[PDB]
Amino acid sequence: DWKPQILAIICNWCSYAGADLAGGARIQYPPTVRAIRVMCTGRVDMLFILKAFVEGADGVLVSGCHFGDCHYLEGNYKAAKRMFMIKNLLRNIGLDDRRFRMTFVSASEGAKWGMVMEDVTNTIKELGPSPIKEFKK
């Protein structure tokens, strides 16, 4: 039974609030994703995601605020640019670009957070362990 290793970097104001609301509503989801809780998900550098993938992450999830709903008014657009370029980079280096995703969860969507956890867990179990672990890292 191989245990997937998904890392999440979720902003304080919307995604973290959404996860808190999901917990408050007693919405169940598998215990596979652990969070980081940056302030604005525009704090997320590309080197964070790449370091996670190198260190042995099986999947990476970054959750922010809906466009036009950022607490700092522009962070999620910078994050979106960075994550689009990250998807390019993971495809072009031979990694599966579907191992990484960025979601937009607001503070009122706990059920959406549970659905996202289920979907990410299912996708990563389908893809299997990261190839980077086998090749000498």
């Binding site: 290793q5 890392l7 304080n12 973290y16 609030a17 996860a19 808190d20 999901a22 917990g23 408050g24 007693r26 919405i27 169940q28 989801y29 598998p30 215990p31 652990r34 969070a35 980081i36 809780r37 940056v38 302030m39 604005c40 525009g42 704090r43 997320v44 550098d45 080197l47 964070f48 370091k51 996670a52 260190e55 042995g56 992450a57 607490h71 700092y72 008014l73 522009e74 962070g75 910078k78 960075r82 549970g114």
Partner: protein, 664 residues
């Protein structure tokens, strides 16, 4: 080696202990790299919990503390205060959310897995806390002055509110008088009170207040700085006439311009009056109207011929200086309020209404001036074509509004329905037997006592044709106006004959308002008005700190809504002045100038314009205005060189969390 961290795990009374093994979590934390003590307690948000935290801090000499409990947004201030009481910096505390994210979502049949997730969360929290520094709270002092740009009702209200709060305030008015648009109105909907009558006490209060410097006939030349200290350079336009204070300062004991008016009586130059929409004559030396706050009689220098007759008209008082130029004043303010107001949309476009080519077609402000008793005539509405009183007046509502054709405006001007009703009432009252026709397309009486006003207007005899005017022709013999539209109710085409046609034109920001709002770093909205900090919960604020918006410059409004907005802006501006300090965000960005390369990419990356490129030790580096930064982290996450330090969320601390996730 030096960091010693204490881990404390809360049971939350079988809320956490019912889903995971707390003993396993504690015994695991006892073996983490930097851990001096690991303890468990039932309710650590209670006073015994704080007592235990303090006792452990004192007896193990902990460098930092990690609490495995509910979400930080619930009890982070609580445990920060707990840690501060005990001899540790508040921001040396770290929290692991093991209830909202581990115990309440993994209840059923997930016991070993939930414990493993708790171990991972505690590991990541300890890894972050081992690299946490001391964040001493710091603040920026605030200059105890305020600036209000715009002397209208919004600017006047904001200035009076700030002054009566005990704050010295500058009121900067472009025109020689403050009153604004309200001074041009004859009556006010829906109460029909005289506008000058309700506004004159406010104007004299502004003029008399010791805490307000009323600088009229001047504008803002440039602005620099931030919320703590705005250095604003103003140009005092050459007024040409001295006030008694300025006359005494100049040297002569003779007073300056008691307002007698002899100069205007002898001036031989005639020019249009902007206050009367250009329908009335005025001299080169003049006042807008009799009820001007500073009764000081400006001279129009680009129209004066320097004949020097007004100086003999003003002898022994020497109030007139024909040969002085604009001065520049550098003022040091704390906050600023923008109240620039509005102007009329140019309805000379939209050719099917003959505003400029037909003589008996006028706009609403011209109508107000023509029907006011202080206007070019004795309040007698007369036709511009021949001066005869009209018996039939049409009102074209929505003139240039809700228009998506690119000529007019796509928004509603908010008050054109109400003052059109007021104008219809005024014509039907002042001229007996006159009939008002209102060509309307969605009558909008939304405010308090507005629907009752609409009912009363209909009851007094006003005709409402529900149809946007298609076009307007004029008869060559009698300059009467044929108005062609459809009565969509009754479903028939209609050609209405009117002696006078009044266009309820849309409103737009005043000329030069966009340059001013760029000068203060305020962004425009997609309608072209000044943008708000938050459209819902901060109607007065702006993204730039220390700048607040009041009045129609934020968007078209009624006088009561404008006054409410102005008072709110005054309160928001007074708050930092009253406190005397602006507390910086606990987690601002710092530039490590030893690593900056002066590329300047990050400058355009901050929504709040905090980042700028400046010299330091002869090198071009980045400078962070801490008063503007908000700890978003966008710049720190971008800079390739790692020259920006997001404290409490630094790159070393976040990577430390990621490293510990993939550890044992």
């Amino acid at each position: 080696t030096e960091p010693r961290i204490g881990v404390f795990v809360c049971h939350c009374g079988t809320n956490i202990a019912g889903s995971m093994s707390i003993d396993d979590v504690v015994n695991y934390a006892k073996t983490l790299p930097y851990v001096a003590v690991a303890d468990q307690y039932q309710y650590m948000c209670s006073t015994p919990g704080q007592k235990k935290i303090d006792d452990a801090i004192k007896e193990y000499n902990l460098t930092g503390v990690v609490v495995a409990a509910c979400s930080p947004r619930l009890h982070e201030p609580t445990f920060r205060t707990a840690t501060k009481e005990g001899g540790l910096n508040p921001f040396r505390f770290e929290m692991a959310n093991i209830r909202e994210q581990n115990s309440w979502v993994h209840m059923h049949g997930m016991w070993d897995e939930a414990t493993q997730k708790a171990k991972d969360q505690v590991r990541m929290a300890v890894a972050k806390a081992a690299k946490l520094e001391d964040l001493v709270p710091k603040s920026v002092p605030v200059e105890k002055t305020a600036m209000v740009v715009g002397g209208g009702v919004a600017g006047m209200q904001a200035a009076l509110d700030l002054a009566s709060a005990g704050i010295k305030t500058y009121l900067i008015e472009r025109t020689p008088t403050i009153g604004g648009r309200m001074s041009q109105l004859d009556k006010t909907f829906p109460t029909l009170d005289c506008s000058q009558c309700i506004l004159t006490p406010k104007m004299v209060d502004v003029g008399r207040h010791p805490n307000i410097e009323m600088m009229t006939y001047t504008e803002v030349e440039k602005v620099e700085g931030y919320i703590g200290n705005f250095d604003v350079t103003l140009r005092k336009k050459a007024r040409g006439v001295l006030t008694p204070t300025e006359a005494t300062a100049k040297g002569i004991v003779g007073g300056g311009c008691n307002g007698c008016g002899d100069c205007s009586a002898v001036c031989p130059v005639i020019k249009p009056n902007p206050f009367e929409m250009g329908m009335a004559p005025r001299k080169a030396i003049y006042i807008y109207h009799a009820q001007v706050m500073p009764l000081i009689y400006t001279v129009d220098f680009d129209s004066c011929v320097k004949c020097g007759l007004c100086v003999e008209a003003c002898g022994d008082k020497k109030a007139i200086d024909l040969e002085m130029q604009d001065e520049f004043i550098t003022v040091k303010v704390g906050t600023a309020v923008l109240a620039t107001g509005y102007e009329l949309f140019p309805i000379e476009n939209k050719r099917e209404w003959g505003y400029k080519q037909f003589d008996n077609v006028i706009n609403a402000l011209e109508f107000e001036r023509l029907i006011c008793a202080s206007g070019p005539t004795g309040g007698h509405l007369v036709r511009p074509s021949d001066g005869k009183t009209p018996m039939k007046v049409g009102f074209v509502l929505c003139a240039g509004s809700r228009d998506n054709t690119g000529i007019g405006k796509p928004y509603c001007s908010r008050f054109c329905c109400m003052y059109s009703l007021k104008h219809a009432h005024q014509i039907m009252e002042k001229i007996p037997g006159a009939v008002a026709y209102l060509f309307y397309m969605d009558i909008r009486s939304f405010g308090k006592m507005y629907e009752e006003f609409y009912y009363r207007i209909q009851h007094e005899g006003a005709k409402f044709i529900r149809g946007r005017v298609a076009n307007v022709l004029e008869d060559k013999e009698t300059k009467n106006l044929h108005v062609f539209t459809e009565d969509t109710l009754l479903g028939r085409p209609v050609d209405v004959e009117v002696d006078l046609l009044v266009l309820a034109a849309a409103v737009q920001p005043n000329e030069g308002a966009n340059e001013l709002r760029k000068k203060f770093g305020v962004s425009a909205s997609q309608d072209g008005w000044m943008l708000e900090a938050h459209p819902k919960l901060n109607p007065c604020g702006t993204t730039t700190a220390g700048v607040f918006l009041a009045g129609v410059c934020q968007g078209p409004k009624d006088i009561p809504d404008t006054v409410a907005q102005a008072e709110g802006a005054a309160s928001a501006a007074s708050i930092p002045i009253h406190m005397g300090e602006v507390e910086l965000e606990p987690y601002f960005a710092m530039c490590i100038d030893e690593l900056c390369a002066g590329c300047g990419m990050c400058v355009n990356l901050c929504p709040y314009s905090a980042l700028s490129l400046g010299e330091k030790n002869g090198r071009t580096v980045m400078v962070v205005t801490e008063a503007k930064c908000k700890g978003c982290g966008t710049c720190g996450g971008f800079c390739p060189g790692g020259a920006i330090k997001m404290q409490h969320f630094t790159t070393p601390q976040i990577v430390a969390q990621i490293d510990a996730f993939f550890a044992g």
